[PDB]
Structure formats: C-alpha cells, structure tokens
Amino acid sequence: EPYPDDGMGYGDYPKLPDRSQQERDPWYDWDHPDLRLNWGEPIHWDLDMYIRNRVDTSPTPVSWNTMCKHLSGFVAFMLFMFWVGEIYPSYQPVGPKQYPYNDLYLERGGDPTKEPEPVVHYEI
Amino acid sequence: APPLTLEAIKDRVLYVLKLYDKIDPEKLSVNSHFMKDLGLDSLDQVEIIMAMEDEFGFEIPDIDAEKLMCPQEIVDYIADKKDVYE
Amino acid sequence: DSWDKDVYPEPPRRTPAPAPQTSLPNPVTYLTKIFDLLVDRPVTLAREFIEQQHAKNRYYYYHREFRRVPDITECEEKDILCMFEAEMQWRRDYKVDQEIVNIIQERLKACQQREGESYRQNCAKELEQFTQVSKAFQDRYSDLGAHYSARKCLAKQKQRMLAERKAAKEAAA
Amino acid sequence: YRHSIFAVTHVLIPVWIIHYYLKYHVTAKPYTVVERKPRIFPGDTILETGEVIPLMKEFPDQHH
Amino acid sequence: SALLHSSTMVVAGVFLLIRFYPLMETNKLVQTMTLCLGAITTLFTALCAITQNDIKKIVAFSTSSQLGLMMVTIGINQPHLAFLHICMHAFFKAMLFMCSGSIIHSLNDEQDIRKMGGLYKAMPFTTTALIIGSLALTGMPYLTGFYSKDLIIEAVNMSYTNAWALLMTLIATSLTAAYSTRIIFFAFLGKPRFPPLVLINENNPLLINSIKRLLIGSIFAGFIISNNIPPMTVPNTTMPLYMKMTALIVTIMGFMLALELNNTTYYLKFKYPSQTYKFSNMLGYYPSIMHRLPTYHNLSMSQ
Amino acid sequence: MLKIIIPTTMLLPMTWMSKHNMIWINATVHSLLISLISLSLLNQLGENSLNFSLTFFSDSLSAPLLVLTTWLLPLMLMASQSHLSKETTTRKKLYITMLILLQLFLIMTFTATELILFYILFEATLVPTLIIITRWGNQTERLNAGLYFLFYTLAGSLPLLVALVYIQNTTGSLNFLIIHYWSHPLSNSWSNIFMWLACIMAFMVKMPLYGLHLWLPKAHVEAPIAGSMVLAAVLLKLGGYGMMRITTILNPLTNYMAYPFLMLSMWGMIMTSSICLRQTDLKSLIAYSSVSHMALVIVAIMIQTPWSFMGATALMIAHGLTSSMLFCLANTNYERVHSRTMILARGLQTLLPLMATWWLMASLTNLALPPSINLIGELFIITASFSWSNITIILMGMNMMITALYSLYMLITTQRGKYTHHINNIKASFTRENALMALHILPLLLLTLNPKMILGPLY
Amino acid sequence: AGGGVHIEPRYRQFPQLTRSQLIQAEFFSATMWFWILWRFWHDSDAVLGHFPYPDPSQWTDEELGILPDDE
Amino acid sequence: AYLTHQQKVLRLYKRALRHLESWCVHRDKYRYFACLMRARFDEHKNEKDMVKATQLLRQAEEEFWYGQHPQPYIFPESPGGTSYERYECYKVPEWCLDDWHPSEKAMYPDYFAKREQWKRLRRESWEREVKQLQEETPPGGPRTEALPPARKEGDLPPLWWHIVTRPRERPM
Amino acid sequence: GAHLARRYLGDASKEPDPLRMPTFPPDYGFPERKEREMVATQQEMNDAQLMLQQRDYCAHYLIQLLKCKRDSFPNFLACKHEQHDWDYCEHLDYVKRMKEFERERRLLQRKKRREQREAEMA
Amino acid sequence: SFPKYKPSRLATLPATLDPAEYDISPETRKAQAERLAIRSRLKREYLLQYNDPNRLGVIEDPALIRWTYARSANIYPNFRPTPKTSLLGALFGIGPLFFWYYVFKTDRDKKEKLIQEGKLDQTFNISY
C-alpha cells in the first residue's frame, strides 16, 4: 500500500502502520534488537519517529480517550478549586504584627531622613 | 547468584514435578513428557511452566515455553538461558 | 593593606568578648591553636623565605601616564590627525568609567556582606552613591552600541544638552 | 600510616597551599575576602578599646 | 538513584529559592503560585505512591511531595524551616532507598512489592532501618519529623496560607504515613514470595556499617543541631491545639486504612480492578500522554 | 604582519619539493610551527588595532580568527591522512597546496585594511574549496554540491562589489580606519535601504540565513573530510567578521529593517534545530546544528549590542571548533563503515570506548555547558536579546530545548547503546584519531579559563 | 566463590541468620526506643504544646475595651 | 505462523494468572484462584462448531484485557523488566580477540591458541556446512527459519558459529 | 477554624478579615493608649544583627538569649529558661494580637447592633 | 458492562482486543507462508554472509539504503506543487514568521513608547 501521492514526495514508499520498535516482539530473534530490526525486510519512512527510545505506538490497558478525560478532568479541578481558595485562604484569628520604631521603617530599607511618622502601639 | 549448575537447577525442577501432586513421586522421570508420557496435556502444562518460572526467576519464551515439555528438554534451556558449562 | 581606605572604605573591626560561664572545654578555640601551630607556622616560614629572596632584588615599575589631548569638541571636523588622539582619549575614559562603577560595585558588594542584616541602613549611603554613579554613567554612555565613538558620545551629550537647555528656558516661564 | 600519608599530601599539603593562597595572595588584594562583623553583644569588650557595649536595661519580667 | 534522586540534588532547585529568600518572598503574589505549584505535587505525587508495585517510586513520590513542602514554607515566608526540612529529608530518604536497594541485592534483583514476604525475620536490620526511616519521615516527635515535619505542618497551619495549600499538606502527610506502611507490610508482613533458592542476606558488615552510620542521623537528626543553630523562625508559642496535633492525627488514619487494605491482600477474595488503583500506578496516566502525545506531534512536524 | 603571511606563501614550495614519504610529515611539522607564530597575534592593545602596515592590520576581533585558521591547517592534514593515502604523490602535493592556499587566503582576508582588499580575498576562498569539494569529494551529488556553493555565495557577493565601489566614489576610501572615523548615518531613503541590502545580503547568504542555507547540507555532507571541517569552522565566519566591520556605516537603518532577518534567524534557529533532530544522516546534523548556532550570531550583530558582539566572537570560535570535532568524529565512523547513517552504527563505546569519551565531551561542548566559552558567548547573546526585547527568550529558549534533544541524541545511537553483531569492520582506534581529537577539544577547555582574548574587541 | 560465602545458604530454609544481625537489629531498635521515649517524658512539653491557648469567648468587654450596647 | 486455539489459550493462561498473582500477591489466595481458573478453563473444553469456540474465545480476550493487571509483574531478566538487556552493555563480540596487540597476545597465549583452533574449526567446517545446506535446501530458498543439522558424517551443524559463539548471557 | 467559618459561611461583617483588620481605633472603647515599649533599642538589635522579621517587642529576651548561647558553646543544651520567657512575650504578644483580633471582633459585633439600634428606630 | 478500550495513533488497539485478527480464514493462513519464506531467505542471506569467515567487510541491508535515499533524495523528484502543499508551506513557513514579526514588532515599539517621555526604569541598566 504505497503512500498517498499528493505533493508528498514519498512515491514508491508504502504506508506503514503505526507500529513502534518498542511494540514489536521483544522475544523474536531480531538481527538488530536495538530497535527490533531484522535483515532485508522493509523499513518505515518514520522509523526513527517510532523507535524504542522515542515515541511508542503500543497497546495500553485502558482507552486513550479515558486518559484524556481523567487528565483533563483531574488537572482542571485544582486551578478551578484553587481559584476559589484564592478568594478564601486559611489563617489563625490573630492580629497583625504591631512593631516598634514606626514598624521597622527606620531599618526596613525605607529612608528615615524624610519624616518617618512614628507608628507606635500599646498593649490593649 | 552462585555458579549455578544444571544438576542443581534440574533437581530443583524434579522437585516441582514431585511437588506436583498430580505428577506422582513415582511418576517422576527426567523424561516425563506431560501429555503422552504423563497425560497432563498442554493446558495442564502451561500452568506448570509458570510454576517453574515463578520459582526459577527467568521467563522462558512462549514459543518454547509451551513446547519444551519433557523435564530434560526444559532443563536443557535453563542450561542455555543461564549458559553455564558446570 | 596594599590598598587604602579612601578608595576602599571598610567598616571598623568590633569583636565581642566571650565569657565562658560553662565548663566544657571549647573545641573551637583548640582547633584554632592547633591550626596556627601546625598549618600557619610552616607555610609562614616558607612565606618568610620568599620575603628576603624577593628583597635581594626589587626591580621597580612606574605608572603609565598619558597627557590629556584636545577633545573631539576642539578636534576639527573630518580631520584625521587630531581625531586620533581625541578618539583614543575618549575610549580610555570609557574603560576608566567601567572600572569605577566596578569599584563602587565592589564597594557595594563588600558593604552588604560585611555589615550583615544591618546593611539595609549601613549601605544606605552606599546604595545612594551608586545611583548617582550609574545614572551619570548612563548620561555618559547609553544606547551607543558596539560601534561607539567619541563623535557619537558627543552627539548623545549634545542631544541631552539642548533638550535640558530648552527645558530650562521653558522652566523660566 | 595509611591515614597519615593521606593527611600529609591529600589533606595537610592541600591546607598549606590554600592557606598560602588566600591570606597571602587573595587578601593581599582588597575586598576579595569579606567578613560580616560578629553580633557584638552588650557586656562584651572590644579587644582594643574595651568599651562595654551598652549594658542591657531592665526587663518587663516575664517568667513561667 | 539513592545518591542523586532521593534528596541530594533534587533539593538544589528548591534550595535555589531559599537562597533567593531575601527577594523570594518580597512579592506576596509571587509567593502564591509557589503554594499552588507545591500543593499539586503533594496531591499528585503522594497519590501515585498510594499504589506502586516497586520500592523506588514510593520513595521518589514522597520526596516530590516533600519537595512540594519546603517551598511552601518560603511561600508563607519561612526560609529556614524549608532549609531544615531538606537536611532531614536527606537523612531518612537516603536510607529508604538504601534499605530498598539492600532488598534488591539480598533478594536477587527484585523491586516490586508483590514478590517477597517475611522480610522481618529474614531481614531484621533492614526491617529496623525501614521502620525508623518511615517513622522519621511520618512526623514523629524527637526525630527528623519533629523538628521538620511536625514544625512545617504546624507552621503552614497557623501562618497565612490558601486553604488548599494547607489541605494538601495534611492529606499528603497522611499519604506519606499511608504508603510508608503499605511497603512495610508488603516487605515484612506476608509469607515469603521469593524463589525457593534461599539467598537473602545482610551479613556483609560494610553494608551493616553504612546503615548504622546513617542510623544516628535517622533517629537523632535535628536534635544534634536543634539548639545549636540560631532561631531564625518567628515562633507562635500559644495557638489552638487541634491543627497542631493534626500531623499526629493524620498519621493514624493513614496507617489503618493501609492496614485494612493490607488485610484485603490478606483477605481471600478477588479484588476487582478500579480506576483508582491504575490512576496511582501509572501516575494518573500522565506519562502515558506527555511522554507520548506532544513529542510525537512536534517531531512528526520535524519530519 | 608578514611574520605569518610569507611562511605560509613559502609553504607551497615546501610541500611541492618535499620527498615522497615525508610530505605530510613535512606539512604538519611546519604548519604547527606557523601556528605558534600566529599565536603571537594575541598581542592586542586596548582599542587601537594592531596596524602592521598600510594594507595589513589586525585587532581583537581578527586575531582569534587568525589563530583558529593557522592552527586548523595541521588538523585537516592529519585528518586527511587516512582518506587520501591511496592516491599518488603529485595530487597529494596538489591537495596540500589547496589547503595551504585556502589558509593563505583566509589569513590575508581577515587582516586586510581596505574593504575591497578584504572582498577580493573574501570570495577568493571559494576557488580552492570548489576544487576541494568537487574533485576530492566522495558521493555522486558532489558535482551539484560545488555549484550550489559558489552560486549561492556569488549571488550576494556581486551586489557587495557594486556597493563597495559606490562608497569609494562617495566617501573617498573604503579603508576600515577611515570609514570608521568618518562614519556617517545611513539615511532611510529607498536608495539607501537597497545600499544596506547590498552590503548585508552578501554575508547573510554565507551566514547562512533561514531559507538561504541549502548549500551547507548539500556541501558539508558530501564535502571531503578535510574540506568539510574548514567550511564550517572558519569559512562560515568571513561574513561574520565582515559583518561587524561593515556595520559601522549602516546605522541607523539596521535598527529599522533588521526585523525580517531577526525574524528569519529566530524561527530558523528553532526550525533548523528541530529538523536537525530529525535527519537520518549524522553529517547533516552537524551541518544543521552549525547554522542553528550560526543563526544565533546574526541576531547578535543585528541588535549590535556590545554584549551581542561579545558572544558573536566567542560563539564563532566555539562553534567553529564545535563543528570540527563532530565532523572529525563523524568521519571516523564513516570510512570504518563507508556510510554516514547513524542507524547503521550504534553503541560504539562497547567497541571504541576512548572514541566515546571524545564524542561526549564534544557533545556537551555543543550543549554550551559553562564555564566553557560556548555558553558564555552564547549567553551574552541572550542578555543582549533580552535588552532588545524581553520576550526574545522564549523562541531562543526553545533553542535550549532542541540542541541537547539532538546533541546527546546521536550519542545514545552512535557511541551509546548496544552493537549490531554483523559489523566486524569496526577495529581499534588509530592514535591519529584520538591525537587530532586531543588538539581539537583540549584548547576549548584551555582558553575557557581565560575568555577575555577570544571575547572580542568589546573588552 | 569457593573460598568464601561464610553466609553459606541452602534451599528452602531460613537463611541462617547469624545472631549478630539479630542482636544488632534489636540493639539500635532499643537505642532508638530509648532515645525517643526518654524525651517523651524529659521534655514532653516540647511535643505536648508547653504553652496553652486561650479560647476567646472567655473574655470580658471591660478588659477588652468594648462598650456595651448602651452608649 | 498463524495461531490456533491451543497456542493462543496457552498464551492467554500465561498472562491471565500473571495478572492474578500480581493481583493477589500472597500465594494462597492466588493459589485458590489459579486452580479454579483451571477448572473454569476446562469448564467448557467440549464446545460445538468452531464458530462458538472462536466466539467464546473473543469473550475470553476482552475480559482478559480489562482483567489484565494494569501494573503486572515482569521478571527483570526478561523483556520488560529491570534486568532486561541490562548486561548488553557488557556484551562484546568475539572478533575483538583477533586484533589483540602482540605483546598482549603473548599475555593470554593459551586463550588465543584456543581461539586459533576455534576459528580453525570455523573455517574448515564452514564451507562443508554451507554446501551441504544449499544442496539440501528446497527450491526457493528456505521455506521457514529452520536450520539443517550435521546429519552426515564429519560435519558441523550448518550456521553454528555465531550461535555457538554467542556472548554469554552474563558477560560481566 | 471558627473565625474562617464565621467570615465566609456566616457573616464577614461580624468577622475580622485578616487584611482589613484593624478597622477601629485602639482608643474606641479602650482609653489610655499609653504606647508600649520594648527594651533593647534599635541600635541594640542592629548591633545584635537581629533579624528584621524578629526585631519585635520581644527583642529584649531575644538578644540576651543569644548572649548566653554565645557562651553556651560547647554545650548546646543550655539557656532553656531565657529561651521560654522570650516565648512569654511571644506568648504575651500573641494573645495581645489574639486580643486585637477579638477586640475588633467584639467591636464588629457591637457595630452591627449599634447601627441596628441607632439607625432603625426612625 | 465494563470500560472499553479504543484504538489510537499511539495507543493502538491491541491484537488481542481486535476480533479481526481472530477471523481465521484460508486467505490469511495461505498468506503467512510467503512472509515465512521471504523472511527465511533473508535470515539465510543474513546468517551465511555474517557467519562467513571470509566476510571481513560490512553486510549492507538493501532496505536500509532504500530508506535513506527515500527520506532525503526522492522528495523533490516526486514532489508536486499541490494546493495543499502551498498552504502547509504557507502556515509552516511565512505564516509562523509573521507570528514572530507581529509579536516582536509590537513589544519593541511598546518599549519605544516608554523611554521618550521618561516612564521606564533605568536605575541599574548601565550595561547597554
């Protein structure tokens, strides 16, 4: 079954089903078990596309659509539900950190040469 | 892993056949061929292949797992699979 | 101290006075005492070796100085003789100006680490003095590209110059 | 002795040539080695002047 | 794998943020998605380790769950609490892989949980090492967990944080307490599942030595340096008691839920396959697509 | 500067009159000697260039190129030892003459003080390389290889010539010093933009530029082993060295119409790197990776940021070396197997461990791993681009996605992995391959420690 | 090998656990039991939450400065 | 060749309990299950016309594949496991023995002497093993990937060298 | 948390929002705002190299804690007493902040009943 | 029932799940002999030359160099300028370029809208 002939450049080369080199029989006496090749038999145009190291076309126990549903369904929950917590965080019913010396602004980088209005507090 | 020997590794498997309550201890032979010399056919053999494999570590390839059927022709392969001259 | 504090100011040395009210022998101090005796002293004598052998001959070097040339401002247009000097002079000043922000950077670098968390106020003058160095450095050199030139430096200097001169006239109101 | 020669030429010679390196060549160059001032604490005396860094005032007396 | 990918170079990335702590926490928003990135790891990674038929994935996931906690502390402006976390992280996670590799060597090149049993009696010291290593990580007072895991759980609990950033930590810590016992069970509790040829051993003193040289770390850990290091953490002293003990709470139901499921493997009955078991084992089917879909399309375009 | 020019000119009588056996022994033993003579040119002033005479001068930009060329010349000698042993002696002398003449034209070209003198010696180099590529090539297509080479380079070269004489008649001198001091703003008139197009497209073609790059895959792949390294190592870089020289009078139009080129480099560098990861020929990989790195330096010159000129020089030498070991390595697999397919030979460390050691360190050198000057020069381009545009990082950051995706890829399918049990041809490594490997990679770690000299004139 | 394997194993019995690895296992187990319960009473306040937390409903508006709904 | 019910349900029964032992882990549970699948496997070994024999087989594979343990147990030394192709890194061909250096050749003289006679019996028996193989080869080359033996006198079993000289499974 | 539940699930007008608090002056219902004072002055903490985030009103026991710890070495197991009276100001400051959260809260409750009684009569 | 697996470009339907491979038919049984024979000779012409002591060179694979020529050389001699090829070249050539042009031209001028009346930060940017 030669490749479709429409401005494609493959011509004589035949359509090869998406069978990766990992998918082929690992128990066969392959001449080149590196990617499970043999001698003389035809080779896929995108052979290096689907080799054991690279992408693989092998059966999975459960349908690819299922991954798509869980992977989308799984990940979509947090950033949604984590968006909700962006409005609703958690903390302890404890007041702010009232601080001496105008709230560190003397020594918290802020320039004190300009009038550093002293924000002081008292034990309520 | 020791210098594993065929004599040691087969005496392991002759135990499995004598531990096969179906394969009577008197019915033990190094050439106990299961479907016609013993009667336990291919179906009554492939589970034993996994049984020895479960206790051997190696997984004999399926093309000869169903085929290597007489205890000596199996233990020939662990001799091949381990590739030890003893 | 081959350097000097006028170019390289460093904070004064203030050390505490430990009062070991505890009883356990302080291992840290003993590690120093063995360290100076076992490590410093032999290599020090080797260092004392390199002193007088360096002292038996001490050839001197002197500073390389250049007379200040007429600048491109007085360099005649399209002239090639006195353009050479003024272009040379400007590029040395370019290399000079990189090393002084480097020196302020090195002064900046030492100020933080040697002053700990107190550097937030201890480098306040050190932080401020860099900004005037950097901003004036940009006015000296900015958007000049790889093929910077004394003419192009003056073109930028002029470009800023009439803009503020016109702004000053506008500010007169 | 195996440890000893391991000290002399894989530890003791190495500490020699770095010791010679920093405080005699690197610190001969300014600002290469920087040092944060120790957290000097009231009641202590600086080695030169002996000034007792201002002695700590009274406490609001918390105890448990 | 124990040397690199347990806690020694993975922490370099998070250690980079704690190095940048003077500017890491300056922007409150920039802190926020740290808690976001960290939280999803802990939920996801610990979920993966909830079912893993190996002795390597669980450790790695419980690390990546942990690496999803130190930067949570800097996410709530706690650099040193993150910093002490990695120190204890290496102290016990080195062992968990160390003893696991001992199983792979003693029992000939076996890693999956479902191929070996009775490791308590046959492998006593590695059993003790695995017990304390899990005990160290699962927040236990006066060990690595106390100064680090107990401290972080309480710290994120009372500091300002998003509700889910909190929620994962208690869940993940429960999961860390969960699958730690799941592998302990399959390791020791259960009849031998190894080939009749008996070769399991640890008599090699050098392996024994190497364990005990790190044993002192796995039980002592922070205490050797607890009061030694200066306090960079702003304490809270008094605070409500329920979430301070949550770490000790989340451990206990992490245990018996594994225990009863361990007893389901004890219970003679066919356990039906379910999406949850596969979801944990194949990493939520994440590498099934990410290692397959995007690289295939881009490089086919490259063809 | 005739310290270096004349001994290379004389090298032709040397090889031609040498005895039958030595020739190559003679050729190397003196080409190394010239190399340390050219190593003298590392003496730069601050900014005033080394003006040796009225027609010859050098600066901090030219000198690293001169040392690269002069020291390169022994390397293709030893590299060609294996490939060309069978041929008779007279053509052996002729082949060395082409190599020496090529390096001869290179050193004067980089050191010309007048623009047209540079131009006459710029394109004078295709004449010997056309001989090298076409005559001594291996595969059939080599015939079309040479045609693609010269015609591409010439198609832009002639517009430069017409532009150059125009500047001569307009300003009065094409000399670098005069044109630099009397540099004038190139206005935005349609006449001037075509003048800019004339003075830029010549170097852009043999830069190459995305789309204008077909010659390297059709030349370097089928070029002779010696010829292949020389093209990528230095003969890539005449346009670059020219580019930083002619960009002194094209302002400000460069900052206005460099966008199509900055475009075509940025997308091309990702495009070339991605397709590099998807070739069946290993030799095409170094060719396609070369332009990917080479497309980076065109970005440097276009923004003409000082930092961009920093890495333009460093990456030039870094890549110029980088392509050299890979082509040397890719050669070593070829004649052993007489094919350039990475699939045919895999996992060579099980047979050639030392070759693998050289293979990986050259590969990680291509990765731009600091402190190697490959990264620091390449990094300075990133910083200049960010100054030009903060967004720039992602497209080029995609280039730090594909490089290692392929630059370790042939490792795990040429030097790393298992071996096919049918190739008994693979034998031990002749010390020549490892020896030239040593002179190839050992420098790059050496001047890594001291990057200022090969940093460039912007120091 | 032949001149070694002092852990000389056999088939389908206990792998001759020498007493060493046993009383080693019980040693550091006893050590770490000793270590962690010793502080479970020495400084139990460290884990018990030495300082208590006040329920906030147990406060009065006089000491809290809220005027009752009369002003 | 093509697969027939016996070859295929033996293939089925391999994987099926490989999932089951990995499902149950503990021996005894899977033990009761494995022996009852055995009865469940012989509960219908008398089926009528092969269409049903195939159709029930179709039902066996589908429930097998969704009953396939998603994370099954694979022995490391076999394909799919940890030790699969692990020692191929140490695998090295035998022709590297030939190019050994003469000084190093005299450091392993006996082993190089044995390879001399081993390659000797390679050459003196290669031509006879192949010529016999071609004459006994049926027309159209081989009809299967089989190998004729040294059936006659004073010969070696054709195409033996590489498989006799295969590297050991633990090259270490 | 009860405060979290009342703010979101219940009413946030009667629950101090952590960022919006304080919403009332400390003198509203609590007169004599006599500014409290810690002890070891800003030079002291500066000379103590004290952490900015910890230079709180409990700074007094902090530096004296590190005083004895400066001489507690070699033995790390020292200065427990001065450790946990620092926790006592941190105890006192925490409940004071706890006092702050509920003081606004009790003002928040009262504020609801206040406007309810001083706006709904007419 | 139970969840049902589906074929995919990378998650292909297993042979075990597909009933088509189970459709035993005379055409498939007779077909397998030819592949068995052609692979047999290929194995034969692999082993003899490989196991031949005289074969000191490299035994090439005819399928190997058919692919190498195919993937690089045969494209243009077989290429035809179909309308779809122009469209794909447009959306993979000039198309993506204009994507970078529009995005890069914009922020560049967006920056240029910042400097002129002083609204850009240059406090430390002295390494232009």
Add this chain to the structure above:
Amino acid sequence: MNPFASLTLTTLIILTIPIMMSNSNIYKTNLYPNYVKTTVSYAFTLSLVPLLMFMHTGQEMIISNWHWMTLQTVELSLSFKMDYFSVMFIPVALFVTWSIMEFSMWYMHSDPFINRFFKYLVLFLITMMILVTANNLFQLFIGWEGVGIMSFLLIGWWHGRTDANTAALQAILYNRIGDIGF
C-alpha cells in the same frame, strides 16, 4: 578569620584530588572505591571544623579567590557564598554520599567498571557543593547543569538498557525546561 574559609576551601580541593588521580590512573583498580571512600570521609570530618565555627561564632563570609574577566561594569569573579546555608549543608550532604557509596560498593561489585562508577560519584559532589557555596549566579548555573548532565551519565550507567537512555532524555528535558527560567 584565619580558620573557617581555608578549611572548607580545602574540602572542595581535597575530594577533587581523587578525580585527577583517576585521570592519571594512579589508582590500582579496586583501591579507588575505598580510596575515594576515605577522601570523602575526611572531607566530612574536616567539614565539621568550619561547622563548629558557626555554632559558636555564627559568622559567615564570602571569598573571591579569582577574577575571571570584567565585562565593563560586570567583573565576573570566582565568588563563593559561604554561610550557614553553605557550611552546614556540606557535612550532611557528603556524609550521606559517603554513607551510600559504601552500600554501593557492596551492591555494585560485579561490573568491572567499579572505578569508572566511583569517580562518577566523586565529581558528582564537586558540582553539588559548589552550587551551595557559589555566590555569583553564573557559578550556581555551572553546577546546575553539572549535576544535570551527570545524572544523565550516572543513570545511564548501563548502555545496554535503552529505557535508561530514554529516562535520561526526559530527565535532561525537564531539567532543561527548568533552567530556561534560570
């Protein structure tokens, strides 16, 4: 001042020593695994000496022992951020490495590349602890890839495994994705 820096700087120096013996091949095969074991062990025991300085004094300090070049206003120098984060990470790290590589030599005992492995672990610490001691972000980046490309080599300890080579690809890929932000 006199102690502290010089001691830990020796630690960086002293376990680099196993590497350039390894290149010079002064190791007699099986000696090297124990040889590096010893050097790492003293590298631990010496690392506590700077540590002890931190428990008592608490001081930290940055060393700039070399200057690479000056990019006008940027003078890249060999600067080390030596501090509490740096000094205390040292002993815990390599003692853990010293602890594990002992378990390695017992485990990793049959593959004849013991030395090649053990040196591979040795340079691995070199890239690690320079990240935690590095002050200039460039030096941190140097160690950043240094562990990354070396994890690739280390996890690829067996080239027979193609999954290992596969595993390294995403390991470098995901690491490369991280350092884009770097």
